[PDB]
Ligand binder design. Structure first.
Ligand SMILES: [Mg+2]
Lengths: 263, 223
């Protein structure tokens, strides 16, 4: 059963770059296995789940509404804004913006949502307040993806991210419809095909969010399980590699194949 | 049937690799390391001397006692007994050292007092090898790291504990010569990493294949 860990190590050796990984039981929160779990990695677009968690938490407390509309003005359009670049005229509701930020990784959507909560510092405050004292967001899209070596801005650790994700998706931090909306948005992720979904067998459930940035940075956070039901959380990050995006994708997909095989 | 392990970076206290690190397992001989830790804490406190000689009878000998069985006449110093209890897993030596601190409950209270509320020793040798006398990979590693780094022991005692532990893969410094293994990894006399492995089950071989697979997963702080 350390086979998966040996594969992560091989990935690290194939990429010439640090890889971090943790697998947690969704119900108990116990760590099942881990590799560099307490090293810092850039979050990249995996933060968009935590963002929409904070946006959902404010919806639950009456400070935000799903149906509130946001207009925004072409000047706000940062690169990879596939959904938001189609609604220059009419705008987009909070619900649509979370949908775009999660399912399509729309960068402008994330910035608009960040503004609704008071920016990076308020996301970081939201995290500290729920017991995550590691994860920090500092910048906006697209700067948060720079992945400068030794820069602790905009980073998490695999263990901190995994525990946080778990608290968002289970228990009572969010309401039932909110919890379910967040996991449904993650289920409907359309831009993480090459990662753990490429190794997922028939009939398995996966709710995920991937990220990609500069300087070889790539990752994914996921809740998955056999028979249409999530039972574990997986977080994989890497940074630093000079390998191609497809090689990074492949490495993550093969770690996924290993943890699935040794489930 | 079950395996759990953890490798920790000593300088940082960060977990490098883990597999079922919070499952409970019988300590088996890994308690001996912690015992020698409690002994050295007493030395540091001016309550015990490693040069102190102890005589013991043939009513003290229990199974696997390779050193102590040979010194019923002349006895053995506290330091010798610690060396025997870790390096030779000499079960009488562990029982005699236990008496010097005040029994299982006093080791267990030593651990409580240093932040470890998972690891519990209740029995003496040989009865401890049959939820009593258990730990988890993470608690044992975290406790050992506390012993070996900064605070808890003086620098004399820390080096002494290491040198006993450094007195299975060829790169591993193995404390002990259903099972527990503690290994230190790194330069002689100053390991950078510790590995703690428990297995309950087994066939000489296949445990050795499992051990080699764990060996393949081990890493170091990224430079
Ligand atoms: Mg390494």
């Amino acid at each position: 059963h350390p086979e998966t860990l040996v594969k992560v190590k091989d990935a690290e050796d194939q990429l010439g770059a640090r890889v971090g990984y943790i697998e947690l039981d969704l119900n108990s929160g116990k760590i099942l296995e881990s590799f560099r779990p307490e090293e810092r990695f850039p979050m990249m677009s995996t933060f968009k789940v935590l963002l929409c968690g904070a946006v959902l938490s404010r919806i639950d407390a009456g400070q935000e509404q799903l149906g509130r509309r946001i207009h925004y003005s072409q000047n706000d359009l940062v690169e990879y804004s596939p959904v938001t670049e189609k609604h220059l005229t009419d705008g987009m509701t909070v619900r649509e913006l979370c949908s775009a930020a999660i399912t399509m990784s729309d960068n402008t959507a994330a910035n608009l949502l960040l503004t609704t909560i008071g920016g990076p510092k308020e996301l970081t405050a939201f995290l500290h307040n729920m017991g995550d004292h590691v994860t920090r967001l500092d910048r906006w899209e697209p700067e948060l993806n720079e992945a400068i070596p030794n820069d602790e801005r905009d980073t998490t650790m695999p263990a901190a991210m995994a525990t946080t994700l778990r608290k968002l998706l289970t228990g009572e931090l969010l309401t039932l419809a909110s919890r379910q909306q967040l996991i449904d948005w993650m289920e409907a992720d359309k831009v993480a095909g090459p990662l753990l979904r490429s190794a997922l067998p028939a009939g398995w459930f996966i709710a995920d969010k991937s990220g990609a940035g500069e300087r070889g940075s790539r990752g994914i956070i996921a809740a998955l399980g056999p028979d249409g039901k999530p039972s574990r959380i997986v977080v994989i990050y890497t940074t630093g590699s000079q390998a191609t995006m497809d090689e990074r994708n492949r490495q993550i997909a093969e770690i996924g194949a290993s943890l699935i095989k040794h489930w």
